[PDB]
């Protein structure tokens, strides 16, 4: 909830609220009552929707990729090394903070489409997909039927088409006390090698495939991945990203103007 | 009284004739690491008075065309006496700092600097497909400089001031701890920075932590006759420095 | 089985839904919290922080630290206008890129008082009085000091206190204005004029700069989350 | 162990009920009701307070 | 519940219930007992169904539009700028009141159909749609695969065919203290520009599309949108709309007779 | 926090039970049981009452 | 899982149904109520108001 | 029927899920536990046991 | 939960913690504090995830096989004699212990595919499968329609395509006091005959088939079987399997090196 | 007969609720909360204790 504006009247003092020294690096706590005659207003406005949690807590696509029912070996299955920097939207939000701690709610939207070399009497049974998460170090699949798909330990989801977006919750899996959105440092003590946020990035890889083996007609499926931070804690706010993004692994940017321009410091015409 | 100020750390004292307050971190004052927050198990060294004192870096001259300067901490202090020697012998370390930026002019001079400490200031390369190199990032106790036009370089930092080397509006650097030095009223800025990081301690060579940026938003200006040599000096003091993981010295 | 009946909504995936879900990593032991300085809880804590406004955002100045510097100098005339911009924080170029404007852009409605602080960067030997004003909509924008002066104003006198605050009260017929720019939701005009003049002694510059900052007052709040129009993308970054 | 909270109702003119069904706190719904707020960290980090009605620079 | 009719008998008074002065602008509170001999009747009739809430609280189609699986760029996706004036039915009901405040229950009925250039072996996997709400100001999509469909902040629903009408509840999102059904005023203080109810209308836009990309055979899907006011409050009742509607953005009408006619003031023949 | 109300039963000759499961009051079902009623606003807005058995114009 | 059994009616969309549904805008803070003259609660309040009857509704 | 609403996640098979499930063999009487030396409860009990390290793991 | 490291300082004693005699077959209980100056650390790390139950309690594919809708008599139906040794992953985990006792959660993922001799107007109704468990001794099926499929006593599951992985729980069905993962003995007292773990293996057979009889077009279905130990008790831990597996019924192996090699006992270069 | 336990929460800064619906204990969910731990069986099976600060071989 917000502040009531308390009624105030005439003044003729030597207390000067309006005059300060911004050099101190301190934001003035002035309110209308200090510089004009105010009436009393009982303010009921709440700041419920600007809470960091409500700000970040909405599912956002972080990526998508495709794989095919049949066609052999790249095509057959797909994989994605988890990271939140390949999309503009979410990435800019998380990036309004330097460090953050949160749980995640993953939701997957999986859709399928038919490809042109059609075939007659094509009548395919429903499709079931499998998504497997391979923590750093785990044996990774090499083709749609590698032994690793038996997932005796890696977690996986098997989902059938037409049945509602599979979903899971994942804890704060970070190894530090928070996820770092920025890292002005290197991976190696000699500073040779990578520099920047990518040095920290090691959250594993997702692997997806069709379970029912390839039928006559070719089918392509796309897996859209959604992230939803939950139970959010965020520290050290920073300016929102100005320059558009260029690369997923660093902050590289093309210089850009501070704002749009207008004709003179006197123009009321809103752009 | 109260615009005047005196700070003593170790065997060093700083005095100011006209300051504002002292901006303190995010309201947090520096302190040693607590047993509940610790992970490295070895007993830390906490030299104290020998390491938490005022080190005065190289001065820099403010000219009517200077776009700004920046220094990276701990880097800037890696060669300062025992603070630097402790950095070498230890895998881990942590510290806070009292930063005091100095700049006196005249009453007939004018200008205004933004003095900010940007925690975790990852910088962009001038050429999009590369990473800047160690030296474009930090020249140690020697300030690097922003530029008033797009920097070009095959491995340089994209230093055009307007995006503060980070791809953001330089005018919003304000959500970070800062003060201004408006020659008209000020002459120094003092900022105490607590240790801010996503881990209790860290290696001091491979991670920078925060960058001090001094950027003039209103240019130095004066009438002919007035002295044209207006230096900006930076004196810094580590606070509550502890180190862990002693071994032989160096980077690598 | 317990007789059950499914309702519309079943099986949909609404992006702002809020349900429980199984954890893929049962009994995972998270790493102890720490205690990092600077925790943030509400975007409004950020919007309440002063950011430098690029008032001088004309043409070529927009890529220069100059966008931030309001020009002020000694003049042979009285009551000249120093600058002017509308109270359209969400959509106007002058304000929409500040901390406040950026946050407004993640929302659809806003409401509150705004503080504009002016910091004089002349020299200690310069003096001058300015009249900062806010004029609710309805009539036009003030074109003269006599017109501006009839509205909400503060008379800033330059001296030891470099800075001065014009606080813009919330005077609307609604409760909430759109961040989006509607004539229905027009918010008025902010303008500044010389009250006297920048008087300076010989051997002191007559040309000075003034910086201006913005932040929300304590009655400010935003509503209705939406994506910002400020960040585009053609395809996944790599 | 049902928990009864309050719904967002509005202001110038009611409860819910939740039971957690999973063994892991990460499975829980969002903390959409946390309204803590402290600007002082960023708006007034100055060591020497700063009163409003007072002469900022003494 | 309604009033009992209290028994009454003969009278011979100088109290005259039947005679009044309607000039006062006051409706007479007469009941049978005042003008005839009444018997007592215990009335159990309730007015439960004429409560404003039960009157408005039934889902009503407010619009529908279509988009196609394949075919490129207009066709590909659809959009609708939310408003309740393009349908006769609902619009006339809300319009029996000048101001109203209420929550909404949106329900969507989405159906698909095959188009003629058929193709052989056409066997399409189930379709998943996405509906996105773009609050005023949000970056709007320009083609089926614009970045804006990642919805990191705008709310969206992903729904698969064959699974029951997606549904949500939306609060009173108005910026005034009530939704205005009428506005005898202008958007600009100089009265130039728009006049009427449309000046207030700024509730955003809905955007829909197929998620699975275009297959061989063309498919067209229609999205029917339902509104159901809930938790209703209504002020200043007005006469029901007589003249048919002509435009969605104003009250423009063709003059029309007050009622149907009959042969004379004496005809009992109901029309 | 289950609420037990009364069903519409009829008149010349029973309860329900509801639990709200969502954090927002807008998610709640309809207020189909509000029977407030005041015609006086529109049927008798006259400042000087107006008795029925009396001579309307004195 | 709690053994359950679906009944006829499941998944239909009846226009006069009355169920709860998730809110697309969680924690949205509505604008305070006001107090406008003339509130209406039952259509019968309207039907109880005199309206002029067009008895002379002949032809022209 | 009790009005219900299915959520995302319904019908998926997550390998690390933890739900109840009907037993295919109702009332099956298991064989009494015994008490075998060496029970293990946490893999860490094993990692806390010394194993001989092949430091001299050169080529042949 | 793990141990706090207690702070310690200088020493000059005749207590020698660092010196022991490993000949005793006893692992030293030394901690940092015994050999260096330690600071105090309140350790919050928990060993929740290394509990034997969390280690084994994740569904793992133990096998899969196929059968066809039509095509006659081998093809028609499939069967599998239950055992956990035909897969590497799970088998190696259970094998880290000599004896174990646990319940099981079986989950089946069944998927179908179309085969090439297609046919026109192929439009097949949904498929229902039946899985039957035949305890040792029960009459086993000989063709898709043998009397034994009536299952008056053997348990069976009937599952329809598109409806979520069928699942059951099975108790510890062992006849000993625990399942033995190893058995250094024979089945016959004269030692002639089988030797090894297979002597114990007698858990029955699973039988699967399609229920709807063969349609025009050929269809092949694969049944993937998942095992998830629950309510686990494990005794006598053993070294993890080094050599890869060769046979399902015994421990036969090809000798293999103890580790990968490196150039000298002095090389810090991690392989 | 609902049982309320504690969720895995984390350490430097809540309950669930379970009801069993089947007649057989084998139908129950996992025992993911059993944290018993005794290395002594394998780390110190020596009959004559063995103190740390002491001369192992007397
Ligand atoms: C069965 C599916 C399981 C899926 C498991 C996914 C686990 C990955 C969660 C990643 C959360 C990462 C958010 C990003 C953090 C990074 O910004 C920082 N660079 C790390 O410090
Ligand atoms: C994920 C889907 C979200 C859908 C959100 C839809 C929000 C729009 C609700 C509109 C309620 C409008 C009823 C009409 C009001 C107008 O009559 C008045 N002109 C406004 O004063
Ligand atoms: C309707 C489907 C019913 C399915 C019933 C399956 C029952 C079989 C459970 C087998 C558990 C076996 C795990 C392996 C144990 C072996 O290692 C040992 N050789 C036995 O001592
Ligand atoms: C793990 C599944 C949880 C089962 C929840 C069933 C509904 C609980 C009935 C209400 C009991 C109230 C106190 C307990 O909780
Ligand atoms: C957010 C989901 C709400 C879960 C409701 C489960 C059913 C509640 C059992 C009855 C408990 C009575 C008192 C409480 O409520
Ligand atoms: C065999 C099916 C079990 C049915 C469970 C229905 C939910 C139980 C309501 C809560 C009752 C609490 C005490 C009992 O249990």
Curated annotation (Swiss-Prot), chains A, E, I:
Transmembrane segments: none annotated. It is found in: Virion; Host cytoplasm. Interacts with capsid protein VP0, and capsid protein VP3 to form heterotrimeric protomers. Five protomers subsequently associate to form pentamers which serve as building blocks for the capsid. Interacts with capsid protein VP2, capsid protein VP3 and capsid protein VP4 following cleavage of capsid protein VP0. Interacts with host CXADR. Forms an icosahedral capsid of pseudo T=3 symmetry with capsid proteins VP2 and VP3. The capsid is 300 Angstroms in diameter, composed of 60 copies of each capsid protein and enclosing the viral positive strand RNA genome. Capsid protein VP1 mainly forms the vertices of the capsid. Capsid protein VP1 interacts with host CXADR to provide virion attachment to target host cells. This attachment induces virion internalization. Tyrosine kinases are probably involved in the entry process. After binding to its receptor, the capsid undergoes conformational changes. This is Capsid protein VP1. It comes from the Viruses.
Swiss-Prot record, chain B:
It is found in: Virion; Host cytoplasm. It comes from the Viruses. Interacts with capsid protein VP1 and capsid protein VP3 in the mature capsid. Forms an icosahedral capsid of pseudo T=3 symmetry with capsid proteins VP2 and VP3. The capsid is 300 Angstroms in diameter, composed of 60 copies of each capsid protein and enclosing the viral positive strand RNA genome. This is Capsid protein VP2. It comes from Swine vesicular disease virus (strain UKG/27/72) (SVDV).
From Swiss-Prot, chain C:
Transmembrane segments: none annotated. It is found in: Virion; Host cytoplasm. It comes from the Viruses. Interacts with capsid protein VP0 and capsid protein VP1 to form heterotrimeric protomers. Five protomers subsequently associate to form pentamers which serve as building blocks for the capsid. Interacts with capsid protein VP4 in the mature capsid. Interacts with protein 2C; this interaction may be important for virion morphogenesis. Forms an icosahedral capsid of pseudo T=3 symmetry with capsid proteins VP2 and VP3. The capsid is 300 Angstroms in diameter, composed of 60 copies of each capsid protein and enclosing the viral positive strand RNA genome. This is Capsid protein VP3. It comes from Swine vesicular disease virus (strain UKG/27/72).
UniProtKB/Swiss-Prot annotation, chains G, H:
It is found in: Virion; Host cytoplasm. It comes from Swine vesicular disease virus (strain UKG/27/72). Forms an icosahedral capsid of pseudo T=3 symmetry with capsid proteins VP2 and VP3. The capsid is 300 Angstroms in diameter, composed of 60 copies of each capsid protein and enclosing the viral positive strand RNA genome. Interacts with capsid protein VP0 and capsid protein VP1 to form heterotrimeric protomers. Five protomers subsequently associate to form pentamers which serve as building blocks for the capsid. Interacts with capsid protein VP4 in the mature capsid. Interacts with protein 2C; this interaction may be important for virion morphogenesis. The chain holds residues 331 to 390 of 2185 of the full protein. This is Capsid protein VP3. It comes from the Viruses. Disulfide bonds: none annotated. Coiled coil: none annotated.
């Amino acid at each position: 909830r917000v502040a009531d504006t308390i009624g105030s009247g005439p003044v003729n003092s030597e207390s000067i609220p309006a005059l300060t020294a911004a050099e101190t690096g301190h934001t003035s706590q002035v309110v209308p009552s200090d510089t004009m005659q105010t009436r009393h207003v009982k303010n009921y406005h709440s700041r419920s929707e600007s809470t960091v949690e409500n700000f970040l807590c909405r599912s956002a696509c972080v990526f998508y990729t495709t794989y095919e029912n049949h066609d052999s070996d790249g095509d057959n299955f797909a994989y994605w090394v988890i990271n939140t920097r390949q999309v503009a939207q979410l990435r800019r939000k998380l990036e309004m903070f330097t460090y953050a701690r949160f749980d995640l709610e993953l939701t997957f939207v999986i859709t399928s489409t038919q490809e042109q070399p059609t075939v007659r009497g094509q009548d395919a049974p429903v499709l079931t997909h499998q998504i497997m998460y391979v923590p750093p170090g785990g044996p990774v699949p090499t083709k749609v039927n590698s032994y690793s798909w038996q997932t005796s330990t890696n977690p996986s989801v098997f989902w059938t088409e037409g049945s509602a977006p599979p979903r899971m919750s994942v804890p704060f899996i970070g190894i530090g006390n928070a996820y770092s959105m920025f890292y002005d440092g290197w991976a190696r003590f000699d500073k040779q090698g990578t520099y920047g946020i990518s040095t920290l990035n090691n959250m594993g890889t997702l692997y997806m495939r069709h379970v029912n083996d390839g039928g006559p007609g070719p089918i392509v499926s796309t897996v859209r991945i959604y992230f939803k931070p939950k139970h959010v804690k965020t520290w050290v706010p920073r300016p929102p990203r100005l320059c558009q993004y260029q690369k997923a692994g660093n902050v590289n940017f093309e210089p850009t103007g501070v704002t749009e321009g207008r004709t003179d410091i006197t123009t009321m015409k809103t752009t | 009284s109260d615009r005047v100020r005196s700070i003593t750390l170790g065997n060093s004292t700083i005095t100011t004739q006209e300051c504002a307050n002292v901006v303190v971190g995010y309201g947090v004052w520096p302190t040693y690491l607590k047993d509940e927050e610790a992970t490295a198990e070895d007993q830390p060294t906490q030299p104290d008075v020998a390491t938490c004192r005022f080190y005065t870096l190289e001065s820099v001259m403010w000219q009517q065309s200077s776009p700004g300067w920046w220094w990276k901490f701990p880097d800037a202090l890696s060669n300062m006496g025992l603070f630097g020697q402790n950095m070498q012998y230890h895998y881990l370390g942590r510290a806070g700092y009292t930063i005091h930026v100095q700049c006196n002019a005249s009453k007939f001079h004018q200008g205004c600097l933004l003095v900010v400490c940007v925690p975790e200031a990852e910088m962009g390369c001038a050429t999009l497909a590369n990473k800047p190199d160690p030296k474009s990032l930090s020249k140690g106790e020697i300030a690097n400089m922003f530029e008033s036009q797009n920097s070009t370089g095959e491995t340089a930092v994209q230093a055009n001031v307007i995006n503060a080397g980070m791809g953001v509006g330089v005018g919003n650097l304000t959500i970070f701890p800062h003060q201004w030095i408006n020659l008209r009223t000020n002459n120094s800025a003092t900022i105490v920075m607590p240790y801010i990081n996503s881990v209790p301690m860290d290696n001091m060579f491979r991670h920078n932590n925060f960058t001090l940026m001094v950027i003039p938003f209103a240019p130095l200006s004066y009438s002919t006759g007035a002295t044209t040599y207006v230096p900006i000096t930076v004196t810094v003091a580590p606070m509550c420095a502890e180190y862990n993981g002693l071994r032989l010295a160096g980077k690598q | 089985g317990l007789p059950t009946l499914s309702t519309p909504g079943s099986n949909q995936f609404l992006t702002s839904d809020d349900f429980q879900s199984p954890s893929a990593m049962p009994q995972f032991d998270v790493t102890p919290e720490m205690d990092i300085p600077g925790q943030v809880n509400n975007l409004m804590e950020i919007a309440e922080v002063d950011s430098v406004v690029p008032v001088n955002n004309t043409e070529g100045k927009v890529m220069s630290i100059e966008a931030y510097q309001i020009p002020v100098q000694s003049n042979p005339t009285n009551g000249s206008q120093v600058f002017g911009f509308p109270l359209t924080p969400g959509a106007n170029s002058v304000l929409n890129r500040t901390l406040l404007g950026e946050i407004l852009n993640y929302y659809a409605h806003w409401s509150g008082s705004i503080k504009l602080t002016f910091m004089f960067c002349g020299s200690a030997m310069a003096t001058g009085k300015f009249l900062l004003a806010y004029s609710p909509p309805g009539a036009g924008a003030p074109t003269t000091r006599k017109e501006a002066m009839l509205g909400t104003h503060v008379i800033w006198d330059v001296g030891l206190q470099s800075s001065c605050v014009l606080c813009i009260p919330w005077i609307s017929q609604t409760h909430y204005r759109y961040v989006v720019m509607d004539e229905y939701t027009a918010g008025g005009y902010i303008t500044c004029w010389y009250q006297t003049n920048i008087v300076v002694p010989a051997d002191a510059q007559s040309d000075c700069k003034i910086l201006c900052f913005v932040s929300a007052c304590n009655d400010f709040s935003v509503r209705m989350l939406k994506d910002t129009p400020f960040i585009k993308q053609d395809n996944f970054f790599q | 162990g049902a928990q009864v909270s309050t719904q967002k109702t509005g202001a110038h003119e009611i409860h819910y009920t939740n039971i957690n069904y999973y063994k892991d706190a990460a499975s829980n719904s969002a903390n959409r009701q946390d309204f803590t707020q402290d600007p002082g960290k960023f708006t007034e980090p100055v060591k020497d307070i700063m009163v409003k009605s007072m002469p900022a620079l003494n």
